[PDB]
Design an enzyme around this catalytic site. Structure first.
Site, PDB file in Angstrom:
ATOM      1  N   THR A  16       0.659  -1.077  -0.076  1.00 15.81           N
ATOM      2  CA  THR A  16      -0.026  -0.178  -0.025  1.00 15.81           C
ATOM      3  C   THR A  16       0.933   1.396   0.100  1.00 15.81           C
ATOM      4  O   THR A  16       0.237   2.466   0.003  1.00 15.81           O
ATOM      5  CB  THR A  16      -1.063   0.243   1.194  1.00 15.81           C
ATOM      6  OG1 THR A  16      -0.267  -0.104   2.432  1.00 15.81           O
ATOM      7  CG2 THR A  16      -1.996  -1.060   1.032  1.00 15.81           C
ATOM      8  N   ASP A  39       6.049 -11.580 -28.496  1.00 19.21           N
ATOM      9  CA  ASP A  39       7.373 -10.349 -28.489  1.00 19.21           C
ATOM     10  C   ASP A  39       8.499 -10.793 -29.316  1.00 19.21           C
ATOM     11  O   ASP A  39       8.167 -11.391 -30.117  1.00 19.21           O
ATOM     12  CB  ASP A  39       7.751 -10.407 -26.973  1.00 19.21           C
ATOM     13  CG  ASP A  39       8.361  -8.891 -26.535  1.00 19.21           C
ATOM     14  OD1 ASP A  39       9.397  -8.377 -26.975  1.00 19.21           O
ATOM     15  OD2 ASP A  39       7.545  -8.057 -25.819  1.00 19.21           O
ATOM     16  N   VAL A 177      -9.419  -5.036 -24.025  1.00 18.70           N
ATOM     17  CA  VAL A 177      -8.193  -5.609 -23.460  1.00 18.70           C
ATOM     18  C   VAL A 177      -7.820  -4.756 -22.122  1.00 18.70           C
ATOM     19  O   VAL A 177      -8.345  -3.496 -22.151  1.00 18.70           O
ATOM     20  CB  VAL A 177      -7.215  -5.634 -24.305  1.00 18.70           C
ATOM     21  CG1 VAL A 177      -7.744  -6.794 -25.521  1.00 18.70           C
ATOM     22  CG2 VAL A 177      -6.437  -4.361 -24.896  1.00 18.70           C
ATOM     23  N   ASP A 200      -6.520   1.387 -18.438  1.00 28.04           N
ATOM     24  CA  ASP A 200      -7.019   0.598 -17.368  1.00 28.04           C
ATOM     25  C   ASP A 200      -6.603   0.541 -15.924  1.00 28.04           C
ATOM     26  O   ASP A 200      -7.084   0.560 -14.747  1.00 28.04           O
ATOM     27  CB  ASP A 200      -7.387  -0.764 -17.949  1.00 28.04           C
ATOM     28  CG  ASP A 200      -8.133  -0.771 -18.915  1.00 28.04           C
ATOM     29  OD1 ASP A 200      -9.670  -0.716 -19.025  1.00 28.04           O
ATOM     30  OD2 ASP A 200      -7.859  -1.142 -20.149  1.00 28.04           O
ATOM     31  N   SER A 224       6.418  -1.383 -21.662  1.00 29.34           N
ATOM     32  CA  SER A 224       6.582  -2.724 -22.015  1.00 29.34           C
ATOM     33  C   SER A 224       6.995  -3.384 -20.591  1.00 29.34           C
ATOM     34  O   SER A 224       6.790  -4.928 -20.760  1.00 29.34           O
ATOM     35  CB  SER A 224       7.976  -2.996 -22.965  1.00 29.34           C
ATOM     36  OG  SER A 224       7.400  -2.600 -24.459  1.00 29.34           O
ATOM     37  N   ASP A 260      -2.928   7.319  -5.789  1.00 27.81           N
ATOM     38  CA  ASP A 260      -1.710   7.785  -5.239  1.00 27.81           C
ATOM     39  C   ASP A 260      -0.525   7.755  -6.259  1.00 27.81           C
ATOM     40  O   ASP A 260       0.579   8.252  -5.773  1.00 27.81           O
ATOM     41  CB  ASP A 260      -1.416   5.998  -4.669  1.00 27.81           C
ATOM     42  CG  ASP A 260      -2.129   5.791  -3.262  1.00 27.81           C
ATOM     43  OD1 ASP A 260      -2.555   6.840  -2.699  1.00 27.81           O
ATOM     44  OD2 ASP A 260      -2.537   4.582  -3.049  1.00 27.81           O
TER      45      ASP A 260
END
Length: 279
Positions: A16, A39, A177, A200, A224, A260
């Site tokens: 946290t 990749d 996605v 997201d 990446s 945060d």
């Protein structure tokens, strides 16, 4: 379980607060899940992978990682020291050449490969795909990412490194996605990280230590590097039974550390991936 002197990003995803160096996680460690790393390949012989990595597909003259990028991302997913999900199975799909480049047609083929190939693998706890790649907007690339997700794979994609709105990049801009931005060890948005409503989640992306080719290790930065933190986290949570491939992005956002991060543009989520592990 506790891994002392862990890379800061692993410690961050189980904390946290920033500024700690022990990674805490349930010992199930992603056992029974699978993560595809789409990749430059994976150096499966690296001792850090412990026999749990293998190449399953290449579109070039070799399946070996001649670059390092794919090996680094795979290490963040699931290497013993540098990985989030230390017992997952890693499958490499080499869609990028040893210069790190690939045609969209090859990348699309690789995504559809994974959607089918998971049916040839044993992944009782679920399947994840980590896509630390992208370029300019393409509806076909987004559609391929959407199909892979629809087929029952948790798809995590890099937001991109342009310090720009990810709506103009693919597969970053595909809504269905999980699009991953990058943060640093002081909880600041990484200087290069893309942003925007399509993101997201954020994961650790600046100065990330992981595996490299030649049986080595190194610290590099990018969205990446953030993406495989989220992919490994998804595999870990699926092994715990807390979520599924179709719901894991939402669950990670639900359970993230909120508010945060600094320098998050208005309209971009302020959510940092967090495993909510209570030892």
């Amino acid at each position: 379980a506790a891994q002392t002197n862990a890379p800061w990003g692993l410690a961050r995803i189980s904390s946290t607060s920033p500024g700690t160096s022990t990674y805490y996680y349930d010992e199930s460690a992603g056992q029974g899940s699978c993560v595809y790393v789409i990749d430059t390949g994976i150096e499966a012989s690296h001792p850090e992978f412990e026999g749990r990595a293998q190449m399953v597909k290449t579109y070039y003259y070799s399946s070996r990682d001649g670059n390092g990028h794919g090996t680094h991302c795979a290490g963040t997913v699931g290497s013993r020291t540098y990985g989030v999900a230390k017992k997952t199975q890693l499958f490499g799909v080499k869609v990028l050449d040893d210069n790190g480049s690939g045609q969209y047609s090859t990348i699309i083929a690789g995504m559809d490969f994974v959607a089918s190939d998971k049916n040839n693998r044993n992944c009782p706890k679920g399947v994840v795909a980590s896509l630390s790649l992208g370029g300019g907007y393409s509806s076909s690339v987004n559609s391929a990412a959407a199909r892979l997700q629809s087929s029952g794979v948790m798809v995590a994609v890099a937001a991109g490194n342009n310090n720009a709105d990810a709506r103009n990049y693919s597969p970053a801009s595909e809504p269905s996605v999980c699009t991953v931005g990058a943060s640093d060890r002081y909880d600041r948005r990484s200087s290069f990280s893309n942003y925007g409503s399509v993101l997201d989640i954020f994961g650790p992306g600046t100065d990330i230590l992981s595996t490299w080719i030649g049986g080595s290790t190194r610290s590099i930065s990018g969205t990446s590097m953030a993406t495989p933190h989220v992919a490994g986290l998804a595999a870990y949570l699926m092994t715990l039974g807390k979520t599924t491939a179709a719901s894991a992005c939402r669950y990670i956002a639900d359970t993230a550390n909120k508010g945060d991060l600094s320098n998050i543009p208005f309209g971009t989520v302020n959510l940092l991936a967090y495993n909510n592990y209570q030892a």
